[PDB]
Amino acid sequence: ADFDAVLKCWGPVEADYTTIGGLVLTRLFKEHPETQKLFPKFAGIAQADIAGNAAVSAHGATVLKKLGELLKAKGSHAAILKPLANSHATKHKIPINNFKLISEVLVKVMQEKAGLDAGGQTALRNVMGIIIADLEANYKELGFS
Ligand code: HEM
C-alpha cells in the first residue's frame, strides 16, 4: 500500500526527472553540505552555482529514475538494489546514513512539487526505510558495517 501511495504522486517527478532531480540534489547539498564532498565532480561548487548546473540535474535525474524503476516493482528488490548497494559501498564509498538524508530531502521536494500529503510523506518514509534496510544488509555482506 505504501508503494501505491507514493506512485499516486510520482507523475510530476517522472514528468521532469531533470528539473526535480536538480531540486533534490541542490537541496541535499544546501541542507546537508557534508554530502557534497562525496561527489568529487561537484565537491567545492559554491551553493549559488548548484541549482543551474546541468550535470547536477542530470545526476539527480539518474537517482530519481532508479528510484522510479525500485517503485515500480514494490519489492522485486534484488537485481535492482544489490548493484546499487555494491556501487555505493565500494565505488562511491557512501556511508549508509547519507541515504536517510536524501530520503528526507525527497519527501520535502515531493510535498512541494508533487502533491504528496501527510499520509503520503509517511508512506514515502516507509518505502525509503525498506530500501535503506536492504542497502544496509548488502553493505554488511560486503564488509561495510
Ligand atoms: C536511494 C538513493 C540513491 C539512489 C537511487 C542513487 C542512485 C545512483 C545511480 C543510479 C548512480 C549511477 C550508477 C551507480 O554508480 O550506481 C549513482 C551514482 C552516484 N551516487 Fe547515488 N544514489 C542514491 C543515493 C546516494 C547518496 C545519498 C549519495 C551521497 C550522499 C550518492 C552518491 C553517488 C555518487 C558519488 C555517484 C557517482 C557520480 C558519478 O559517477 O558521476 N548516492 N547513484
Side-chain angles (χ1 to χ4, degrees), residues 45 67 122 142:
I45 300 175
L67 185 55
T122 297
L142 290 160

Side-chain angles (χ1 to χ4, degrees), residues 25 28-29 34-36 38-42 59 62-67 70 80-81 83-88 91-103 128 131-132 135:
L25 293 186
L28 179 67
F29 298 156
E34 75 285 11
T35 66
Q36 195 180 336
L38 297 171
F39 290 80
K41 297 164 190 165
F42 306 147
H59 274 61
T62 295
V63 170
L64 297 189
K65 293 174 189 191
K66 180 59 58 178
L67 185 55
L70 288 169
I80 190 296
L81 278 183
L84 195 67
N86 289 162
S87 64
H88 285 66
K91 291 185 179 181
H92 316 318
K93 303 180 183 175
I94 306 309
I96 197 76
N97 182 249
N98 295 107
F99 290 96
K100 303 176 191 186
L101 304 181
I102 200 174
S103 300
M128 298 311 301
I131 290 169
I132 294 168
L135 290 171

Side-chain angles (χ1 to χ4, degrees), residues 2-140:
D2 285 338
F3 287 92
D4 290 344
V6 178
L7 285 168
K8 284 296 63 96
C9 295
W10 195 253
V13 181
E14 195 164 314
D16 193 351
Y17 279 132
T18 301
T19 297
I20 304 300
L23 291 178
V24 169
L25 293 186
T26 299
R27 184 159 193 163
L28 179 67
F29 298 156
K30 187 188 292 197
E31 299 188 1
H32 305 284
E34 75 285 11
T35 66
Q36 195 180 336
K37 85 275 214 239
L38 297 171
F39 290 80
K41 297 164 190 165
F42 306 147
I45 300 175
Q47 186 65 39
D49 294 326
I50 299 177
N53 184 295
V56 174
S57 295
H59 274 61
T62 295
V63 170
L64 297 189
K65 293 174 189 191
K66 180 59 58 178
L67 185 55
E69 173 191 7
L70 288 169
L71 282 165
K72 290 170 193 180
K74 304 195 199 177
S76 278
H77 316 282
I80 190 296
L81 278 183
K82 286 181 175 185
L84 195 67
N86 289 162
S87 64
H88 285 66
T90 74
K91 291 185 179 181
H92 316 318
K93 303 180 183 175
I94 306 309
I96 197 76
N97 182 249
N98 295 107
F99 290 96
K100 303 176 191 186
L101 304 181
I102 200 174
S103 300
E104 295 293 339
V105 171
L106 182 62
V107 173
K108 289 177 178 193
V109 173
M110 287 192 71
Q111 174 189 21
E112 293 182 22
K113 301 298 190 205
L116 193 72
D117 66 9
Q121 295 154 37
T122 297
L124 179 55
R125 290 190 180 101
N126 283 349
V127 165
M128 298 311 301
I130 293 169
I131 290 169
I132 294 168
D134 188 73
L135 290 171
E136 172 56 18
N138 291 322
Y139 270 50
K140 172 185 185 177

